[PDB]
C-alpha cells in the first residue's frame, strides 16, 4: 500500500548515497509476516562477507538511539 512506496523510497535514497559519497550499502527488510526484501548497491554477498571480516568497533545505531536523537530539537 504505502509500504511499497516507503520501502522503495528507502532503497532510492540508499542508492543516491552510494553514488554521491562512494559507499557500499546493504539493506535487509523483514516485514510483519516475515517476508524478505533486500537491496545492495553492489553485491549482497560481497558486502556481507566484507562485513564479517570487520573485527573492529564502529558506529552502531538502533531504534532506541534514533528515538532519543529525535527527542531533542
Amino acid at each position: 500500500v504505502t509500504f511499497t512506496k516507503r520501502k522503495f523510497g528507502l532503497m532510492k535514497k540508499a542508492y543516491e548515497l552510494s553514488v554521491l559519497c562512494d559507499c557500499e550499502i546493504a539493506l535487509i527488510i523483514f516485514n510483519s509476516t516475515n517476508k524478505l526484501f533486500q537491496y545492495a548497491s553492489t553485491d549482497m554477498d560481497k558486502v556481507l562477507l566484507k562485513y564479517t571480516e570487520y573485527n573492529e568497533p564502529h558506529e552502531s545505531r538502533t531504534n532506541s538511539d534514533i528515538v532519543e536523537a529525535l527527542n531533542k530539537k
Partner: protein, 128 residues
C-alpha cells in the same frame, strides 16, 4: 501467474532444487560462487564470538586470556580463508586454480580445528 496456490509448482520447484543440489556436490565449484559460501562461514563465526563475548565474564578470571587468544586465532583463520578464496577467483581457469582450491580447504581445516579448541578451552573453564 500467481503461484500462491500451485502445489504442482511447489513440487516441481522442490524436484529441480534436489537435482541442482546434487549436481553442486558432485560437480565443483566455480569461483565467484564461493562468495556466499565463505560469507555464511563468516556469519556463523560472528554469532559464536558474540556468544563468547557475553559468556566470558561468567567464567573464572584464570581462563579469560586463554579464551581470548583462541578467539583471535579464529579471526585470523577467517581472514586467511578470505585471502585464499580471492586468489582462487583470480585464477578461474589457469594452472593455479587447483592450487588455491587446496589452500582454501587447508584454511577450512584450520577453522574446524581452532574452533574445537575454543570449545575445549571453554569446557575446561566450566569445570569449577
Amino acid at each position: 501467474l500467481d503461484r500462491s496456490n500451485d502445489k504442482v509448482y511447489e513440487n516441481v520447484t522442490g524436484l529441480v532444487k534436489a537435482v541442482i543440489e546434487m549436481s553442486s556436490k558432485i560437480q565443483p565449484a566455480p569461483p565467484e560462487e564461493y562468495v556466499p559460501m565463505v560469507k555464511e562461514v563468516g556469519l556463523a563465526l560472528r554469532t559464536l564470538l558474540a556468544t563468547v563475548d557475553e559468556t566470558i565474564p561468567a567464567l573464572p578470571a584464570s581462563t579469560h586470556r586463554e579464551i581470548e587468544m583462541a578467539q583471535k586465532l579464529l579471526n585470523s583463520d577467517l581472514g586467511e580463508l578470505i585471502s585464499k578464496m580471492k586468489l582462487a577467483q583470480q585464477y578461474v581457469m589457469t594452472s593455479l586454480q587447483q592450487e588455491y582450491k587446496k589452500q582454501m580447504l587447508t584454511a577450512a581445516h584450520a577453522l574446524a580445528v581452532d574452533a574445537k579448541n575454543l570449545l575445549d578451552v571453554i569446557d575446561q573453564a566450566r569445570l569449577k
